[model samples]
Target: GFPELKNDTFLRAAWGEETDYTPVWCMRQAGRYLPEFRETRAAQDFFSTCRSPEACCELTLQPLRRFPLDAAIIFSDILVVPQALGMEVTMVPGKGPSFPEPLREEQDLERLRDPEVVASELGYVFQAITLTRQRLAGRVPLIGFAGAPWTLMTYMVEGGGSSTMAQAKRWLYQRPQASHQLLRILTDALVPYLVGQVVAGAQALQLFESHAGHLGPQLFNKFALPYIRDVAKQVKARLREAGLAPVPMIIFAKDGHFALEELAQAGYEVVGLDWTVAPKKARECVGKTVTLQGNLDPCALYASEEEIGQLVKQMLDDFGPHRYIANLGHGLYPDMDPEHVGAFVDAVHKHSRLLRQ
Candidate 1:
């Protein structure tokens, strides 16, 4: 009873079991859209709140207070791990996360491989996870998350987020060994980072490969998918050793349309799709084994309330009920109207049962 999810249907469907109703949760569910979230942020700057375990735990539950979602993702960013690892990471208001001096040479790679140092620095994340879990008291499952190795490496070396990973791609193509050195180091660190979250209190874990859209098939298989599989393998083994429930893992490779088959084989129980992949096609590709996690365009929240209801119904029809968890295709944008989010949630509650037919 201590670890039982208030709504176990989501976890059941995630493991490819039958469920009476579809479960739902959103990416970046705690951020900018809600008015109450803005009011709380007025108390502290973004990075300060992010680093403080109590503040992060407070932010984690803000969305659940406003929405009818089934899960709570620990409120934090993927870049926090890099900062803890000694790289300088910043979240400027408009520019997103930036690194002051990126990992560029062998020296940078050498510095990041020390596990003793990493474990000491990243203790804040584990603290936040523990504090948040205690605060939730198992009201709902807490989702712990991280950036995929290749995705984190892209930001670490490019010095910031990018629409085109030109610098990152050049390194991967021209300086293949150097790029992989970074990936290997990040992968090694991520195994323990994720394991620590579960030990702290996360019932489920998600890996956000936000830049997966940039890669073609060959590069994706060579780099991204392999590391994802490795992370999944390591995390599963650690959970088994701990005598835990083999905590469910989800890989959301944003816009990873070309890598569906590769993702299906990546050792995760669930795969998150962006708006680019159709749910029916995703079901066909990944088949009945892996639960599908998303594909709704986040911008759909910008539509009129009437339209929002109709569109959500259409999505439910497209994906059907079992083995699916509803979610926005990507993180919520800052300027989203909160009322529309309410409309979307209401629609999910009202129309989801129609899919059971």
Candidate 2:
């Protein structure tokens, strides 16, 4: 029922298949860097925009209009999962996301809805996925994503972003049972949510463990890795049981250099890296079987176009041509120049082709 994909390079690369050149797409390709995005976002509040499938589709297609990006991640916030689970989240103008009623104490957990019902609660996201895929018309693959259980738990516990995550970590140390209880609730919600995204037309999935660095190796292994593995396992199993093809799954743990070896074995097809990790070292850590996605410094886009091109060339050389996809280490910042972003895109396409030649 879907249009034939015109470009499968991104999907192919994610699955460790050979391609003429490396496929490229940034982490938050549809975010604030583009003037069009900011203009479109002005129409509604963040959650309102996510609630409207038409608006989500428009935002998803915005970056693709300006660049030949290989993938389009749906335009939505990760905190939506918690909201679906009966938490109230507000997108504060300058402060990022805020949870008005965070699950601070064990009693707060009782306020959450049943995990079994979260998928229905998040029907808007599924509708957005279906709408975005239709609008894309096979231009490129759509990636459906959510925050990892540990990351989501952190926000839900701490109420929002944290520098030290002290409050969240306290739960882990002082109330280990409560922490695992919350994590499992998130995983139960996420598996169905991610599965619903694929059924709705998302060709791939990514789980963002953006707060992973807060937990060192021990905490990560205890709290994060299990749910990460469960999400991939459960999503794929559900899709397969329903007779749908399982799409490539990516797990990106920002500043998660310490867990590369474990993440490689975490059931995801691709492991995303941050700019802090060297491309060569990342490859060595993950080994040759799984595809590696990123490590480019987003700030590098602030340099001249020629400088961006040189950086891309060097990056391409380090990543080499096989089993690789090009992308910025993190989401683009709002103050960034769109032209510079274009330079980064153009440089990836140009240099990858040259390297293959």
Candidate 3:
């Protein structure tokens, strides 16, 4: 049986360091659902909250105040990396990220910023991280995050969120040089962005490659995985040089099930899953060393509360309670009832404890 958890159990398990109660947290935990969050946003818009250090820090802590979760993810969007680099990015409430001047020409690469320079420009995010860490007071780990190169470049090139992704895919196939240029620039920027987050007190980091699903096998291997691997390698190297604990890295290549082996090969200690991949199959693909972080369909909450409990239990049974961190396979939809989210977290804790016995 597992021993009782301490503050580090979640951090320990996040790095595949322990056998204990399955630590649980969710993606997008601090948005839309909570009435307090909505009320706060009513005063200031999404972009304002995202760019403001005070607003981001408060929203980052808001969810923890509501739930007994294992980690506190910063309340900032992944696209902030691009914005900090001088790109014009905006969010349309119902739509998603919109990049006005999509990187298309060879000269467009010039728009990218140097890692250290960009890191300096994004000082507020690190400040927010420092402030959030102080407020967390070691109660839970603070997670810092970034958008992967290939994914962010896709949006930047495509001009916004696209359903077809024809432009981005064609650039990958027909204009490989251009695509690589953009990817390399992003890779350059990401290294310092992640290292700076660690410096600011993030105990863990997540890379959200939300657009990875669009890349086919060859392009994904050639473009996506290598850059992501580089990001992880550089971040860990910086941590070692600084004599800080190596923060665990999680790469959520959402819906990119075919690339599991590639993701497993990347240097990240944990690989995140979307709802499409089965947990048992993931265990086989990622092998035993990498701790798995997800695969529960967030929409499962629409089922009866008892059904949600059962689904959470089945995930534990399939992944085994030891090496898995319970979380929604994807994000919790804004429409999901907050009560259901509470129930899901309660179920993970309740059932994971039962299994440990």
Listed per model in order, the count of residue pairs whose N, CA or C atoms clash below 3 Å is 0, 0, 0
Q: How well is each residue in 1-357 modelled by candidate 2, as lDDT tens digits?
A: 888899999999999998998899998888888889989999999999999999999999999999889999999889999999999899988899999778888989999998999999999999999988988999999999999999999999889999999999999999999999999999999999999999999999999999999999999999999999999999999999999999999999999999999999999999999999999999999999999999799999889999999999999999999999899899998888888888888889988999988
Candidate 3: give the clashing pairs.
none
User: What overall lDDT goes with each candidate model?
Assistant: 0.84, 0.93, 0.85
The CA-based lDDT of model 2 is what?
0.93
Question: Which of the two candidates, 2 or 3, achieves a greater TM-score against the reference?
Answer: 2
**Per-residue alpha-carbon lDDT of model 1 for 224-289, expressed as tens digits?**
888999999999998889887678899999979888888988899999999988888988888878
What is candidate 3's lDDT per residue for 236-306, written digit by digit as tens? 99889988878889999998898988898899888999988989999999998888998789999888889
**Candidate 1 runs further than 4 Å off:** 1-4
* Model 2 worst lDDT run, 10 consecutive residues: 26-35
Best of the candidates, TM-score: 2
- For TM-score, candidate 1 versus 2, the one ahead is 2
Candidate 1 residue-wise lDDT at 21: 76
Error of 1 at 231 (Å): 0.2
Q: Which ten contiguous residues of candidate 1 have the minimum total lDDT?
A: 111-120
How far is 309's C-alpha from truth in model 2 (Å)? 0.6
- Per-residue lDDT, model 2, residue 290, is 91
